[PDB]
């Protein structure tokens, strides 16, 4: 697919169609403030190409939206490079929402989950976020319909322990929570249980192949997951590799080069060399 920058879609639903040719959102995604929408506008709407989000995901006051299983059916990794107040996923006041349905969300690399004041929302206790997040203590899933203990959560699905109950884990009524073998770590596995390549992250189409990863554990280059961007490439947005030509076009209306990375600004103590975009140590204080 294609890689698109951060989005902030609100009010109209026509702005939402900007994700039709998008697989990786290099930034955040905020869908919010849609008061006149109905569930009739979401039954036929789908964005199956979206796979990964670099920053966070925000859903707030999107009326009519009852589930996300049809909106983002292939969302797998939320890297959380930049968080929304230490949250990589915020589901706040999402009325009419019946379930999450992100049956492909396998790993949130950074941040926590905030799901608050979402009425009519069930299928929450049937989610083991510890298999998705490393810091589940910082989660905050309260004030939902699942808090009333009377949700119609019905799931073959794997069963784990959250507090002191052996409950089966499933996203919807027909989608379990995919749990890979312990040996696969976070690399992901196939339906049969074969671990993906050690450079994958979440899921893959063929095991033991870094070119078949759905997402990259470190960096993406030439259609293959790599551990580091080798020379003469540069680490951009801490997820993919780019050449000097790419980092140069972004500067001409203001990114720079530092520590083999294409960053927006030189750090404190370095100034940009106007010739080769390379940050150099300043002479005394820098302006």
């Amino acid at each position: 697919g294609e890689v698109c920058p951060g989005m902030d879609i609100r009010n109209n639903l026509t702005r939402l169609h900007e994700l039709e040719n998008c697989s990786v959102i290099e930034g955040h995604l905020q869908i919010l403030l849609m008061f006149k929408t109905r569930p009739e506008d979401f039954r036929d709407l789908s964005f199956p190409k979206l796979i990964m989000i670099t920053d966070y995901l925000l859903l707030f006051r999107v009326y009519g939206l009852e589930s996300l299983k049809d909106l983002f059916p292939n969302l797998t990794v939320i890297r959380g490079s930049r968080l929304f107040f230490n949250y990589a996923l915020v589901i706040f006041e999402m009325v009419h929402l019946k379930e999450l349905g992100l049956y492909n969300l396998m790993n949130i690399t950074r941040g926590s989950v905030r799901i608050e004041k979402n009425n009519e929302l069930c299928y929450l206790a049937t989610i083991d976020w510890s298999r998705i997040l490393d810091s589940v203590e910082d989660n905050h899933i309260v004030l939902n319909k699942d808090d009333n203990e009377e949700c119609g959560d019905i799931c073959n699905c794997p069963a784990t322990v959250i507090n002191g109950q052996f409950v089966e884990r499933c996203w919807t009524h027909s989608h379990c929570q995919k749990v890979c073998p312990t040996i696969c770590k976070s690399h992901g596995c196939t339906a049969e249980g074969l671990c993906c390549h050690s450079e994958c992250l979440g899921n893959c189409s063929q095991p033991d192949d870094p070119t078949k990863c759905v997402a990259c554990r470190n960096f993406y280059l030439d259609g293959r997951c790599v551990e580091t961007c080798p020379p003469p490439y540069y680490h951009f947005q801490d997820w993919r590799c780019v050449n000097f030509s790419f980092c140069q076009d972004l500067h001409h209306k203001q990114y720079v080069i530092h520590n083999n990375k294409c960053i927006p600004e030189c750090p404190s103590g370095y100034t940009m060399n106007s010739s080769n975009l390379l940050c150099t140590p300043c002479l005394g204080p820098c302006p």
Partner: antibody
Amino acid sequence: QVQLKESGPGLVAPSQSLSITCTVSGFPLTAYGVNWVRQPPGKGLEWLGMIWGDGNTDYNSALKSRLSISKDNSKSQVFLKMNSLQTDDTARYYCARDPYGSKPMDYWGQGTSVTVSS
Amino acid sequence: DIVMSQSPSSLVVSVGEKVTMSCKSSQSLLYSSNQKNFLAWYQQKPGQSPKLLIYWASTRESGVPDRFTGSGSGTDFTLTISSVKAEDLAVYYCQQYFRYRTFGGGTKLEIKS
């Protein structure tokens, strides 16, 4: 099933050209680089050049003028052409895959022997 | 233009002995972004193609015995064989892959008999 095979002429007259084809299988050439390394009889390995996945090519600083590396991704083939051969160019020419982001040259072909004489 | 150099050229040794070979680089191979050295060691047994033993200065390739240990950082690197077996009769090359690739002269490891 990663495999790489060389196919050279074996005998080239001096001051002619050498054309070798590396037929790869088991990995996409779009994501892996392929090096060219020769080895004179009884001497050490010598890196000639490599071609990246996007198509960019790097060459030996001493032999950049004579070397030429191209590839065809649909055919899974990498080509090597050398100009103005000499008697000291007699060597076995290998081609090796290069997962440049992770590991160096891992899978090497059996190489092809090329003798430059009259 | 990076230049490698190995030492010694050749060395004879008996079975079950310790062997250490060096590999000096003209330029530091340490990558600042991941703190790893772009150096690999290669073993070429007689009648065979080169085999990747150790990459990233110290990381062993899948299927390499633990007798081969790679040490060093920056410009001075060494390869150590704990207990030399009879099957280790080969020529060992070191290759840098930071910018371009350069092979060393290689150390010929011969086994006494």
